[PDB]
Amino acid sequence: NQTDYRIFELNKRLQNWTEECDNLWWDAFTTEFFEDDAMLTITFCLEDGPKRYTIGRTLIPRYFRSIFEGGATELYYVLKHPKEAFHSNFVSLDCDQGSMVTQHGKPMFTQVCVEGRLYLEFMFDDMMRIKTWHFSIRQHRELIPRSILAMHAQDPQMLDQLSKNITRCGLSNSTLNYLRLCVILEPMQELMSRHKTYSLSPRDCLKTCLFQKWQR
């Protein structure tokens, strides 16, 4: 009744998306549903072993936007039989059978359904905002309109392009490239703080941030 509805509200605001939604819109979307210190984590197994990516609050708007940059024109989450748990200060939601659904546009409109465990922690207050978001992807499917199979039906070169997936584990290149970049850039933010306070060159900022590290 509380956490379940929040995801429905989240799905509902994503239906307002248009191509002109930008930095300010995605930041407003993220402030409505996430804490100022929210953490978001995505997990999957593309090649080699398991990959895990974790980003903080200021990187969370562009994560969601990257899904739309990737071709998605619609995004929603279906949570089948999620487990609630109330604590003194937060509420957990744990859904082993979570589905992330995206609809791509012209041409050859394709639908991507990503399955995984969605684990959430909400703040127990009025704006029941998300403190942690953890999505562990197990597998994904990609669906083709029957009309667009019949379109490229007797065209051997177009019809084997239709057997190639369009995402890798449900992540399109936009999203994957973004999360990987965020590994390097996001702890540079400490360097950037230094730069803003002491007038010091970035490489000296870095030099000085090795200082705290070996010290403790």
Place this chain on the structure above:
Amino acid sequence: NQTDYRIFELNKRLQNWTEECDNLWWDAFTTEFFEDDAMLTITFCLEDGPKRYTIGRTLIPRYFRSIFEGGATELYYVLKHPKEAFHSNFVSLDCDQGSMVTQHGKPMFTQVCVEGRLYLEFMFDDMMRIKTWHFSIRQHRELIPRSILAMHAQDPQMLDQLSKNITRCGLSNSTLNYLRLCVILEPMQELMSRHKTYSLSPRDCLKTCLFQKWQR
């Protein structure tokens, strides 16, 4: 906040469906979301002109069940930007961009997405149950897993069976056959009432129900 959540609750109870759900389960599902005198209407254009089908409350459980008899293993409704309107006694919900989504099972798992206008009237009380349900179908799409395209990839006879739709306007044969049967059987219920009260043969029951008709 009120009507919107009711459809989410309706989607949520449909996730409890299994193959062993029966008369009692579907009747319990219908009593939770519909009035005892609820009316449900489905509209579409298959061939010739427009078809319209309307059923009363005791026929509504098997309508929803017929969707699952037809192959669906999952059913949910997505309402994009629905219009609310509060009155003294009821609440309307009017959604031009409604989507009815069903997932079929083995073999060749297919997803059916039916688009139309969903118009609902809810009772304004505690159990905000549905008084009228009106779904006017404009078009439908059918989606194929890319894996199952690649499965029958170089098999010309299986791959043109994959270009044939599996529903007609999103209605599978089970549902269509059910609604058509209900045109004939549902006003026979008046005959059946007669039969239950006066000991009279069914054809005499019918004879006697022509009596009211020409009389007024």
Place this chain on the structure above:
Amino acid sequence: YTEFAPPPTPMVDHLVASNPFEDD
């Protein structure tokens, strides 16, 4: 042999037990 005994089907053509609403 009791009054409401069924008709013969003089129609020898292969009868189909199909739904009387299904379209052809």
Place this chain on the structure above:
Amino acid sequence: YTEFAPPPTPMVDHLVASNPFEDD
């Protein structure tokens, strides 16, 4: 010509402006 002028690319092979994270 000012100290931080760019290197030559003695690599004549066709350079690609690809994302430095994209997999090959």
Place this chain on the structure above:
Amino acid sequence: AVPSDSQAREKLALYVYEYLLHVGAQKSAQTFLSEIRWEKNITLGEPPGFLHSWWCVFWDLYCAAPERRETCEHSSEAKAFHD
């Protein structure tokens, strides 16, 4: 209240037995009772029985449907029950 599937299944079973009797198929009637292992007692109604009578006025209304009136012989009281 509302019938269960098994209640409905068994009620249909009974009425098909009755149907088989009133239709001159006594052999089928008792074979059927055995193939389905019916044990409870049966008392039946006047011919042609519940199923036959209701099926036949259902089939009439079917044929008297506006969309089947022509090309399907039907009764007139069924026609007018629609109208």
Place this chain on the structure above:
Amino acid sequence: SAVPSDSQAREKLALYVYEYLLHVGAQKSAQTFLSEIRWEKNITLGEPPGFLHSWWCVFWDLYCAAPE
């Protein structure tokens, strides 16, 4: 009777009772029925269960619900 859909109605009922008997597992009853009624054995079935069962489920739902 004298209603003109009756012979077809009764043709169809017999047809669907036979389909019902086969889909319900009454193999011999079905075979016996055919010969008890003078019907050549060349009927092709729908999918299980046939129309009689489907028709009955709707009919009995309405019959039980029909009030006094």
Place this chain on the structure above:
Amino acid sequence: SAVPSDSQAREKLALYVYEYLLHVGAQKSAQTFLSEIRWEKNITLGEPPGFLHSWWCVFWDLYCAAPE
């Protein structure tokens, strides 16, 4: 400097600035840049806008948000 990723870092920056100039609509600046730096004109682009713009959007989001 004397850090050993520097020449490649500066190779890449130049590569991405040139891609940025082309995708931003600075056709002549891009052509001029190449000849001002002694680079043979045979660079193939990514998709618009290139990496420099994408990298910058994340960098500046973090830079603005970085506190004192």
Place this chain on the structure above:
Amino acid sequence: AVPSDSQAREKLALYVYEYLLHVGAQKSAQTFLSEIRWEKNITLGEPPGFLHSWWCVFWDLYCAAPERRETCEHSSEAKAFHD
């Protein structure tokens, strides 16, 4: 607060101009100002400028990433910043 896309776009524009100057590409630098019709005033920082300095320590940390350490020359302070 949070920067808009255009604020970010223009800040990148300015710093690319600065980059072009400090890199010995004064011709490109002013061509660029004209092709994008820049009009506001510019004052710039010491060489190599904001973009060059930040890009280069970003590229270092990239190369000093655990998964790129070998097969990518990098500095040691970047390596240890990770650890």
